[PDB]
From a paper:
As part of the secreted [name] CAZyme arsenal, the bacterium possesses an open reading frame coding for a 220-kDa family 31 glycoside hydrolase (locus tag [name] in strain ATCC 13124) with predicted α-glucosidase activity, which will be hereafter referred to as CpGH31. In addition to the N-terminal glycoside hydrolase family 31 catalytic module, CpGH31 comprises two fibronectin-type III modules, three CBM32s, a putative cohesin module, and a bacterial immunoglobulin-like 2 module. Though the putative CBMs, referred to as [name]-1, [name]-2, [name]-3, themselves are not closely related at the amino acid sequence level, a primary structure comparison indicates that they all belong to CBM family 32, an observation that is supported by their overall similar structures as determined by X-ray crystallography. Each CpGH31 [name] structure comprised the β-sandwich topology characteristic of this CBM family with a short α-helix and a calcium ion capping one side of each module.
The molecular determinants of galacto-specific sugar recognition displayed by CpGH31 [name]-3 were revealed by the X-ray crystal structures of this protein module in its apo-, galactose-bound, and GalNAc-bound states, which were determined to 1.58 Å, 1.48 Å and 2.50 Å resolution, respectively. The galactose and GalNAc residues were well-ordered in the crystal structures of the [name]-3:Gal and [name]-3:GalNAc complexes, respectively, and provided clear electron density, allowing for monosaccharide modeling into each structure. The galactose and GalNAc coordinating amino acid residues of [name]-3 were conserved, and included Tyr1674, His1671, Arg1702, Asn1707 and Tyr1774. The b-face of both sugars formed CH-π interactions with Tyr1674, while a secondary aromatic residue, Tyr1774, whose side chain is perpendicular to that of Tyr1674, mediated additional hydrophobic interactions with the C6 group of each sugar. Galactose and GalNAc binding was further stabilized through a series of polar contacts formed between the side chains of His1671, Arg1702 and Asn1707 and the C2-C3-C4-C5 edge of each sugar. Specifically, hydrogen bonds were observed between Asn1707 and the O4 hydroxyl and endocyclic oxygen, His1671 and the O4 hydroxyl, and Arg1702 and the O3 and O4 hydroxyl and 2-acetamido groups. The orientation of galactose and GalNAc, and the respective contacts being made with the CBM were consistent with the STD NMR data, in which strong STD signals for the apolar α- and β-H3, α- and β-H4, α/β-H6, and acetyl group protons were observed. Alignment of the three [name]-3 structures revealed minimal sugar—induced structural changes (backbone r.m.s.d < 0.22 Å) and only subtle differences in B-factors associated with the variable loops were also observed.
Numbering used by the authors: 6 to 162
The structure:
């Protein structure tokens, strides 16, 4: 029911730009969520007053008909693994449509995502030049405080 990385629709990460994120920590910048690279992450701040939700806004080079993104969790650590999320889109970065909400399954222990590769998230084909991805629940040494993402893969025409 999903599509894999070899969909004719998989936008190239060169098409994407992270224009905004609630916060960023260390050297884990918003740009690392859409650089096509498993080995870089976006991580949000984890100071004392930092809590969820956090979100990141991806700008596309034109407006696309999107119907799926893949979420690639941080490969070396479960810190910031997103387990509940929200997806919104817009043409103008001011008026958002709420596309959907949802969860990703945890492993047996409950300490990391069950699927450590591309977790596909499909939705009904909507036209967009901006997508806001919002982490609602997350894992980490402290749960539900900070989020990370290794990649967001977009699909659309
Ligand atoms: C190298 C590394 O893992 N750094 C993490 C950091 O990204 C963040 O998750 C922080 C919050 O607890 O924990 C650190 O250990
Ligand atoms: Ca990356």
């Amino acid at each position: 029911l999903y599509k894999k990385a070899g969909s004719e629709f998989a936008l190239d990460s060169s098409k994407l730009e992270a224009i905004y994120a609630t916060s960023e920590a260390d050297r884990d910048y918003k740009e690392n969520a859409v650089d096509g690279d498993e080995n870089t992450i976006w991580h949000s701040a984890y100071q004392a007053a930092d809590k969820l939700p956090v979100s990141i806004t991806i700008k596309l080079d034109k407006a696309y008909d999107l119907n799926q993104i893949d979420y690639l969790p941080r490969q070396n650590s479960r810190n910031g693994h997103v387990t509940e999320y929200k997806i919104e889109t817009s043409l103008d970065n001011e008026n958002w449509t709420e596309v959907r909400t949802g969860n990703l399954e945890v492993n047996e222990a409950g300490n990391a995502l069950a699927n450590r590769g591309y977790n596909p998230i499909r939705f009904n084909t909507i036209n967009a030049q901006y997508l806001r991805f919002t982490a609602l629940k997350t894992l980490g040494d402290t749960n539900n405080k900070y989020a990370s993402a290794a990649e967001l893969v977009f699909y659309g025409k």
